[PDB]
Write a protein that binds this ligand. Structure first.
Ligand SMILES: [Mg+2]
Ligand SMILES: [Mg+2]
Ligand SMILES: [Mg+2]
Ligand SMILES: [Mg+2]
Ligand SMILES: [Mg+2]
Ligand SMILES: [Mg+2]
Ligand SMILES: [Mg+2]
Ligand SMILES: [Mg+2]
Ligand SMILES: [Mg+2]
Ligand SMILES: [Mg+2]
Ligand SMILES: [Mg+2]
Ligand SMILES: [Mg+2]
Ligand SMILES: [Mg+2]
Ligand SMILES: [Mg+2]
Ligand SMILES: [Mg+2]
Ligand SMILES: [Mg+2]
Ligand SMILES: [Mg+2]
Ligand SMILES: [Mg+2]
Ligand SMILES: [Mg+2]
Ligand SMILES: [Mg+2]
Ligand SMILES: [Mg+2]
Ligand SMILES: [Mg+2]
Ligand SMILES: [Mg+2]
Ligand SMILES: [Mg+2]
Ligand SMILES: [Mg+2]
Ligand SMILES: [Mg+2]
Ligand SMILES: [Mg+2]
Ligand SMILES: [Mg+2]
Ligand SMILES: [Mg+2]
Ligand SMILES: [Mg+2]
Ligand SMILES: [Mg+2]
Ligand SMILES: [Mg+2]
Ligand SMILES: [Mg+2]
Ligand SMILES: [Mg+2]
Ligand SMILES: [Mg+2]
Ligand SMILES: [Mg+2]
Ligand SMILES: [Mg+2]
Ligand SMILES: [Mg+2]
Ligand SMILES: [Mg+2]
Ligand SMILES: [Mg+2]
Ligand SMILES: [Mg+2]
Ligand SMILES: [Mg+2]
Ligand SMILES: [Mg+2]
Ligand SMILES: [Mg+2]
Ligand SMILES: [Mg+2]
Ligand SMILES: [Mg+2]
Ligand SMILES: [Mg+2]
Ligand SMILES: [Mg+2]
Ligand SMILES: [Mg+2]
Ligand SMILES: [Mg+2]
Ligand SMILES: [Mg+2]
Ligand SMILES: [Mg+2]
Ligand SMILES: [Mg+2]
Lengths: 122, 211, 296, 169, 159
RNA sequence: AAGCUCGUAUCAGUUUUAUGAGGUAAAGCGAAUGAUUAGAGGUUCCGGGGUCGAAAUGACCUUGACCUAUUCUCAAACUUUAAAUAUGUAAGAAGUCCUUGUUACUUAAUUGAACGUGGACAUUUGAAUGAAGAGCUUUUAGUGGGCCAUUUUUGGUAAGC
RNA sequence: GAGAACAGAAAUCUCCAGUAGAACAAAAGGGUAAAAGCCCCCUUGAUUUUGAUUUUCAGUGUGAAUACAAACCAUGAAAGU
RNA sequence: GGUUGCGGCCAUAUCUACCAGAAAGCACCGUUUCCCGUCCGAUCAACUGUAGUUAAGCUGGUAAGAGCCUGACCGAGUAGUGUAGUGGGUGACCAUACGCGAAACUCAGGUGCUGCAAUCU
C-alpha cells in the first residue's frame, strides 16, 4: 500500500492522524456502507448491526479498531464511506498546492500537519 | 558556401560519422592535434591548464582548427616552439548534412557538408602543459582561442601533473619513490601484479626501499 | 613457444573452451546426443547404450543409461575377466571381443530375469540373426551399440563384440555389411569365415603359418602359446568351452579385499601434493625480492 | 635425459614442381614412381596466375611420401649428391629439414631420354617416438616442448650421423 | 519498401549468449515434459527447426501435447481487446521448465506441514502471506557509537 | 437498444511476493569489430632510399610500413557489461497427497502415459486494495479528413513545417 | 612464421601456430568446428494421403513455415536423420 | 585418495614456462598372415602383450604469470532513469522534490566440483 501512496503522491495530501482527528472525523462525517446506501451512523445500533460479527458494536469501538490497526481493519475501513471533507477554512497555508509538502506545497506526506489540515477541512 | 555555424550549434541529431554507409564525408578541416614540444618528458612540464566547455553544443572542425592555430601561434610567438605542449582532446567525427536547393522538399535527405565535434558540459577541449613559469602565457593563449568558439567555455588549472591522472603530490611521491618510468611522450608505472622477474627488469632503481 | 606466436589477453579472454570430454578427445557429442536422446512421449524409458571401448589390449563392455546428473552403469563386463571362463592370452582378439559381448549379454539377462528365456543362439554357426521376440511374452532387452570414436571399418572387433552380445541374447539392431567375411562388391556374407573369426581361425591359421616358416618370430610372438603347450588345432575348443562356462555362470564376482580403499587412499595421498597457502607464496615472493633485487 | 627421446625420421616427401600438365608431368610422375615404388600423387594448381601459364586445377605437380628404411635409403642417395653438405638455413625452427637437387640422374637412376631430366625437392620430417598423439583420432594432443624436435637438436643429430656438414653462420 | 519477415528484427533476440555458442548440452534433451507443465519460451538460435516466433520470446505457457521431438505449448495472446488461444509446436531446444510456481508449491507443502503441527497442539494457523509491515520500536545505544557530525563540503574541481 | 443466465460469485488500465524475458539509456575501447592524436621501444636474407662499398643472404644510417607495452578521441545501422519505465507466468477446492482399474499407445517389464473408482486435510481456503456485482447473446447508428500540449523522436538551417 | 632445384611478390612440397579472423548461390542479420564449412561413398523424402498449427490477420485468403498421423522409400553398424 | 570406461555442469576446467609423479591403469610401444584403408600399416584395419620406455601423453604442484570465476559502504548513491511544479535560464541547458539505480575503476579472495561402474600399495 505504501507503493500505492508513492504512485499517487502528487495528487493527494496525507499523514498520520491523531486520536482527536479520527474521533472528530467519525463523529461528524462518519457514514457506513449499508447495502450501498451510505448511512450516517448516528447510533451504535447501526455499527453493531453490521460490524457486530467482528466485535464492533459502538462508534468508539469502530474508532478504536481504526486507530489501532486491528485484525478487522479491512472490514472496519471498507465499512466507512470515504469522508467528504470541505475545503480547508483557514486556507492551504501555501501559495501553490501541487508541489510536494517539502517544497512549500500541499501534496506529499506531511507527517503530523495532516491533522491541522484535516481539522481545518472537517 | 559554408553555412553559418549557428545552423549546427546544437546536438539535434544522433551521431552520424563517416562509415560504410555515409562514406562520402569531406576531410576534417583540423588534422594536427598535438603541437609544440610534444616529444618532451612528463617531468619537463608539471603545470597543466585546460580549456573546458560549459555547454552541450557542437564545434565545427573549421572553428576547431582556427582556434588551434590562434592559440598555438600566440603561445609560440611569446613562449617559443618548444616551451609548451598543446594537445586538443576533441576529435570531430560528427558529419553535418545539407539539402542543396524544379523540385521542392520531396525526399530532402542531405549530403555531407562538414564535420563537428559533440562536446558535453565540463568536457575539456584544450589541454596545454608547461612549467609554472609560463602559466600566465598559456592562460592568455587559451583566452584568445576562446573567442573562436560558440558558447561559454572556461579555463581551469589542473591539480594533476601535466597530462597525467595523478595530482602533483601523488606523482612526486611515486617518482621520488621509484615507480615511475619515462616513455617517449608519456610515462609508465610499476604495478604490483604480474611477473616478478619481468617487473624487476623494469623499474630496477626501486626495490632498494629508498629514493 | 616462439614469441611471434604467444597468445594475447584478448585472445584468451574472448576464447570459448569446449566441453571437457571434448577437450580430452573422448566424447563425440554430435553422436552422443543422437544416441542418448529418447522419444519425448515415453518420458522415462532410458535409451540403453552398449558402450564398447578398447584400452591398449583390454576390452571394456558397459551397458549405460544417461542421467542429468551422470550416466549410470547397469551392467559391466571387462574382457580381462576371461581367465575365469578359460582364455589366457591376447584379450584384444576378435574372439575376445565376441566373448565379452556374449558375457555381458547373459550377465544382464540374468540380472533382469530374462535368463531362461532369451538364451540367445548356442550352436553358433556364424549365421546372421537378431534376438527375435517371444510370442506372447516380454520383448527382449534392447541396447544400441556405442562404438565411441571407433572408425567403422568392415570386419572390426567392435562389431565382433556386437556379434557376441547379439548371440548372447541382447537385442542390438544391426546390419551385417561390417562383419569380417563381408564381400565388398557381391552381396553375400561368408558364415564359415565369420564363425572362423568367432573362434580364432585367423589367429590359429597364423600360428600354424609361422610354425613352419619362421620360428624366429613365433619365438616371442605367441611365446605364451608355447609356454603353455598349445597349438592352433586346440584354439576352437578353448573358446567353445569358454562359451559354455559363461552361459553357465555370468555371476561377475569381484576382486578380494586386497589392502582396502582407506589404505589405498593413504598410500596414494603420500604422492598427492596439496596446494600452498597464500601467505606461503606471499613470503615465497618476498624472499625472492630480497634475494634478487636486494643487490644480491 | 633421453632413454626414449631418440630422433627417428617420420617421412621423406619428394616433390617435382613441373610447371605445367601433360607429358612432362606424367614423366616426372613415372620418375617418382620408379624412385619410390609407390604410386605418386598429383597436385593441381590452386589459383591461376598466367605468368607461369597455369590454370586452376591444372594438375601441375607430383610428389610422394616414403617412410622408414626406404626413406633413409633415398635420403642417403641424395645426401651423396649434395656431398653431405647443408647450410645453417634449410632447417625448420620446428626440427625438420630439406634440400633440392636438379640432375635427378645423380640418384643412381639412369638417363632414359624418353623421359628427360628433372629436378626434385627433398623434404625430411623428423620426430621422436610417440608422435602418434598429434596424429591419432582419440585423445589427439600436443607433445611436450622438451619432447618435440628442435632446429639445433636436429642439426646436431644430422652432424653426428654421416658427419656430413653445417657450413655457415 | 518495408520488410516484415518472420525473423525480422530478431538479430539480438536470437543472438547466441556470447561465450556460450556451439552445440547445446545434453541436459536440455534429458529434461522431460508432461502435459500441463508450465514452461518458458526462449529461442535457441542454433536450432532453426521448430523455433518459436519472436513474439513468444520471454513468454510462459502450458504444455498441451507431447511428441517425439517437440512439445505443444498453449499461449494466450492479446489481439485487440481480447485474448486468443495460440498453439505452438516448439522443439525441446527452445523450452525451459518454469519456476513461476516453485514458491507456490513450496509454500503449500510448508503450509500443510505447520497446519498439521497446528492441529497437533493448540491450533493457531497463522499461515497467510502478509506484505512487509512497518518497522517497530528500537533503542539505539551510543556506547562506543557516538555520532560523527557531518557538514556539506565546498566546491572543488579535481581535473 | 433489447435483454438473458446467475449472483458473494466471479471481477480489476493498481500494488505486493515468487519466477522469467529484453539490448534502449548509461557505459566501454591500454576488450572484439570499425574509426582516430602522439610519441617511445623492437623487426626484416623480406619497400624504396642512401656513406663504405668490386659485391655480400653486408655492416651502416634513412624513411617507411608491420610487432610490443603506452597515449588523445569516437559509433543509428559497434560491443564484453548493462539499467529505469514498460512486459510474460504463478499466488489452491479446477488444491495437495495416498491407496491401484482401463488401453489397441508406450515399456525389457502392469514399465510408463493419459483418464478413472476408494480415502485423508475446510474459509488464514493461502498476499494487498477495491468491486453501485459477475458472466453471456443478438441487432443496428454514426465514424473511418483529425488537430494540440509535456515527454521520447525522424527529416529539414528552419517553420504557427 | 620458419623451411625445399629451376621458383621470382604469386606455382608445388613440409612442419608449427591458428575461436573461426574462412566458407555456407545471392542482400543483410543471425547460426555453424570430429560442423552447418572441405574431400569422399550411397541415394531421390524435392515423393503419397487428407487434417492441425505459427507469421501477415478480419484471427479471411495467399505466400512461407512448424510439429504429428497414415504410407512407401534413402542413408548409416546404429541410435537416428 | 590414484586410475580407467562412460559422464553432468562446460575455463575456479583455458593459455604460457618449469618441476614432480610409487602402485595399478591408461599410454607410447612390437608385427603385417588374416578382415580392412592408404601416395605412405603415419592415420585407419587386424595380430601380439610378447620385445621395450615414463621421454611424451595423462595426473599433480610452482609463478607479486596472462585469462577466467567470486566478493566488497572500491568507485557510487555517481551516470542514467519513472514522477512534480505558472522552478532557474535568451537559449544551450540546469538545480530541487518523491522514488529506482548501473558500467568502468580499485582492492580482496579463488584456480574445478562432482555422478555411475570397475580397479590399485
Ligand atoms: Mg481566523
Ligand atoms: Mg476567511
Ligand atoms: Mg499565485
Ligand atoms: Mg468546518
Ligand atoms: Mg534532445
Ligand atoms: Mg533531426
Ligand atoms: Mg531545395
Ligand atoms: Mg513543384
Ligand atoms: Mg538517397
Ligand atoms: Mg549533471
Ligand atoms: Mg567562446
Ligand atoms: Mg587512463
Ligand atoms: Mg595487454
Ligand atoms: Mg559419428
Ligand atoms: Mg624414458
Ligand atoms: Mg610455364
Ligand atoms: Mg526496413
Ligand atoms: Mg566452438
Ligand atoms: Mg529446413
Ligand atoms: Mg519483474
Ligand atoms: Mg547499442
Ligand atoms: Mg550511447
Ligand atoms: Mg561498459
Ligand atoms: Mg577498439
Ligand atoms: Mg681492392
Ligand atoms: Mg559520449
Ligand atoms: Mg505487472
Ligand atoms: Mg499487467
Ligand atoms: Mg487476494
Ligand atoms: Mg471489499
Ligand atoms: Mg454488489
Ligand atoms: Mg456497429
Ligand atoms: Mg459499422
Ligand atoms: Mg481510407
Ligand atoms: Mg463502415
Ligand atoms: Mg472523408
Ligand atoms: Mg495537457
Ligand atoms: Mg507542424
Ligand atoms: Mg550470411
Ligand atoms: Mg518441388
Ligand atoms: Mg502491415
Ligand atoms: Mg474473422
Ligand atoms: Mg479473399
Ligand atoms: Mg492458413
Ligand atoms: Mg494453405
Ligand atoms: Mg608402472
Ligand atoms: Mg588399429
Ligand atoms: Mg617426467
Ligand atoms: Mg589417457
Ligand atoms: Mg593440469
Ligand atoms: Mg592471475
Ligand atoms: Mg529524471
Ligand atoms: Mg522548465
Amino acid at each position: 500500500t505504501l507503493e500505492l501512496l508513492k504512485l499517487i503522491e502528487p495528487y493527494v495530501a496525507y499523514g498520520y492522524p491523531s486520536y482527536s482527528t479520527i474521533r472528530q472525523l467519525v463523529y461528524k462525517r462518519g457514514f457506513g456502507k449499508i447495502n450501498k446506501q451510505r448511512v450516517p451512523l448516528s447510533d451504535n445500533a447501526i455499527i453493531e448491526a453490521n460490524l457486530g460479527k467482528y466485535g464492533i458494536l459502538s462508534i468508539d469501538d469502530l474508532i478504536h479498531e481504526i486507530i489501532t490497526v486491528g485484525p478487522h481493519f479491512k472490514q472496519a475501513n471498507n465499512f466507512l464511506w470515504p469522508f467528504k471533507l470541505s475545503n480547508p477554512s483557514g486556507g492551504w497555508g501555501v501559495p501553490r498546492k501541487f508541489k510536494h509538502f517539502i517544497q512549500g506545497g500541499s501534496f506529499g506526506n506531511r507527517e503530523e500537519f495532516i491533522n491541522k489540515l484535516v481539522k481545518s477541512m472537517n | 558556401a559554408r553555412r553559418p555555424a549557428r545552423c549546427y550549434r546544437y546536438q539535434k541529431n544522433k551521431p552520424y560519422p563517416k562509415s560504410r554507409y555515409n562514406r562520402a564525408v569531406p576531410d576534417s578541416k583540423i588534422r594536427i592535434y598535438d603541437l609544440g614540444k610534444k616529444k618532451a618528458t612528463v617531468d619537463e612540464f608539471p603545470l597543466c591548464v585546460h580549456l573546458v566547455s560549459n555547454e552541450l553544443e557542437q564545434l565545427s572542425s573549421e572553428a576547431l582548427e582556427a582556434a588551434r592555430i590562434c592559440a598555438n601561434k600566440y603561445m609560440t610567438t611569446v613562449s617559443g616552439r618548444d616551451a609548451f605542449h598543446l594537445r586538443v582532446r576533441v576529435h570531430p567525427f560528427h558529419v553535418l548534412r545539407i539539402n542543396k536547393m524544379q523540385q521542392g522538399m520531396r525526399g530532402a535527405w542531405g549530403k555531407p557538408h562538414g564535420l563537428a565535434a559533440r562536446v558535453d558540459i565540463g568536457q575539456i577541449i584544450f589541454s596545454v602543459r608547461t612549467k609554472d613559469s609560463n602559466k600566465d602565457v598559456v592562460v592568455e593563449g587559451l583566452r584568445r582561442a576562446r573567442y573562436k568558439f560558440p558558447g561559454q567555455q572556461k579555463i581551469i588549472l589542473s591539480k594533476k601533473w601535466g597530462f597525467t591522472n595523478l595530482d602533483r603530490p601523488e606523482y612526486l611521491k611515486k617518482r621520488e619513490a621509484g615507480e615511475v618510468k619515462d616513455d617517449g611522450a608519456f610515462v609508465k608505472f610499476l604495478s604490483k601484479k604480474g611477473s616478478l622477474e619481468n617487473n624487476i627488469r623494469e623499474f630496477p632503481e626501486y626495490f632498494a626501499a629508498q629514493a | 613457444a616462439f614469441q611471434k606466436d604467444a597468445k594475447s589477453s584478448a585472445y584468451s579472454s574472448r576464447f570459448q573452451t569446449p566441453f571437457r570430454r571434448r577437450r580430452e578427445g573422448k566424447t563425440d557429442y554430435y553422436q552422443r546426443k543422437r544416441l542418448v536422446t529418447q522419444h519425448k512421449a515415453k518420458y522415462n524409458t532410458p535409451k540403453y547404450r552398449l558402450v564398447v571401448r578398447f584400452t591398449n589390449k583390454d576390452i571394456i563392455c558397459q551397458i549405460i543409461s544417461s542421467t542429468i546428473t551422470g550416466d549410470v552403469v547397469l551392467a559391466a563386463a571387462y574382457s580381462h575377466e576371461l581367465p575365469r571362463y578359460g582364455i589366457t592370452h591376447g584379450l584384444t582378439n576378435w574372439a575376445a571381443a565376441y566373448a565379452t559381448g556374449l558375457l555381458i549379454a547373459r550377465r544382464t539377462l540374468q540380472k533382469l530375469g530374462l535368463d531362461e528365456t532369451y538364451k540367445g543362439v548356442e550352436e553358433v554357426e556364424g549365421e546372421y540373426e537378431l534376438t527375435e521376440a517371444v510370442e506372447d511374452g516380454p520383448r527382449p532387452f534392447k541396447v544400441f551399440l556405442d562404438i565411441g570414436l571407433q572408425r567403422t571399418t568392415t570386419g572390426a572387433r567392435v562389431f565382433g563384440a556386437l556379434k557376441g552380445a547379439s548371440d548372447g541374447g541382447l537385442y542390438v539392431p544391426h546390419s551385417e555389411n561390417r562383419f569380417p567375411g563381408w564381400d565388398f562388391e557381391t552381396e553375400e556374407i561368408d558364415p564359415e569365415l565369420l564363425r572362423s573369426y568367432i573362434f580364432g581361425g585367423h589367429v590359429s591359421q597364423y600360428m600354424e603359418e609361422l610354425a613352419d616358416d619362421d620360428e624366429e618370430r613365433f619365438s616371442e610372438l605367441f611365446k605364451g602359446y608355447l609356454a603353455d603347450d598349445i597349438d592352433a588345432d586346440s584354439l576352437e575348443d578353448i573358446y567353445t568351452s569358454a562359451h559354455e562356462a559363461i552361459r553357465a555362470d555370468p555371476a561377475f564376482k569381484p576382486t578380494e579385499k586386497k589392502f582396502t580403499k582407506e589404505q589405498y587412499a593413504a598410500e596414494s595421498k603420500k604422492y598427492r601434493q596439496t596446494k600452498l597457502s597464500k601467505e606461503e607464496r606471499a613470503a615465497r615472493v618476498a624472499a625472492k625480492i630480497a634475494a634478487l633485487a636486494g643487490q644480491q | 635425459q633421453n632413454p626414449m627421446r631418440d630422433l627417428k625420421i617420420e617421412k621423406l616427401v619428394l616433390n617435382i614442381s613441373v610447371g605445367e600438365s601433360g607429358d612432362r608431368l606424367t614423366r616426372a610422375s613415372k620418375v617418382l614412381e620408379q624412385l619410390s615404388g609407390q604410386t605418386p600423387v598429383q597436385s593441381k594448381a590452386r589459383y591461376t596466375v598466367r605468368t607461369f601459364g597455369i590454370r586452376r586445377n591444372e594438375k601441375i605437380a607430383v610428389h610422394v611420401t616414403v617412410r622408414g628404411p626406404k626413406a633413409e635409403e633415398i635420403l642417403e642417395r641424395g645426401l651423396k649428391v649434395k656431398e653431405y653438405q647443408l647450410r645453417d638455413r634449410n632447417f625448420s625452427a620446428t626440427g625438420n629439414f630439406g634440400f633440392g637437387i636438379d640432375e635427378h640422374i645423380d640418384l643412381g637412376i639412369k638417363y632414359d631420354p624418353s623421359i628427360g631430366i628433372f629436378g626434385m625437392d627433398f623434404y625430411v620430417v623428423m620426430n621422436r617416438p610417440g608422435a602418434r598423439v598429434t596424429r591419432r583420432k582419440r585423445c589427439k594432443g600436443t607433445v611436450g616442448n622438451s619432447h618435440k624436435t628442435t632446429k639445433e637438436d636436429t642439426v646436431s643429430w644430422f652432424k653426428q650421423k654421416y658427419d656430413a656438414d653445417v657450413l655457415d653462420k | 519498401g518495408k520488410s516484415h519477415g518472420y525473423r525480422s528484427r530478431t538479430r539480438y533476440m536470437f543472438q547466441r549468449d556470447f561465450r556460450k555458442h556451439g552445440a547445446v548440452h545434453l541436459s536440455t534433451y534429458l529434461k522431460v515434459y508432461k502435459v500441463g507443465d508450465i514452461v518458458d519460451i526462449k529461442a535457441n538460435g542454433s536450432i532453426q527447426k521448430g523455433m518459436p516466433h519472436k513474439f513468444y520470446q520471454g513468454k510462459t505457457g502450458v504444455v498441451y501435447n507431447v511428441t517425439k521431438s517437440s512439445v505443444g505449448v498453449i499461449i494466450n495472446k492479446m489481439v485487440g481487446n481480447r485474448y486468443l488461444e495460440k498453439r505452438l509446436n516448439l522443439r525441446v531446444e527452445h523450452i525451459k521448465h518454469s519456476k513461476c510456481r516453485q514458491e507456490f508449491l513450496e509454500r503449500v507443502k510448508a503450509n500443510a506441514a505447520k497446519r498439521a503441527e497446528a492441529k497437533a497442539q493448540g491450533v493457531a494457523v497463522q499461515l497467510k502471506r502478509q506484505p512487509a509491515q512497518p518497522r517497530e520500536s528500537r533503542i539505539v545505544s551510543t556506547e562506543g557509537n557516538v555520532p560523527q557530525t557531518l557538514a556539506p563540503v565546498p566546491y572543488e574541481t579535481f581535473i
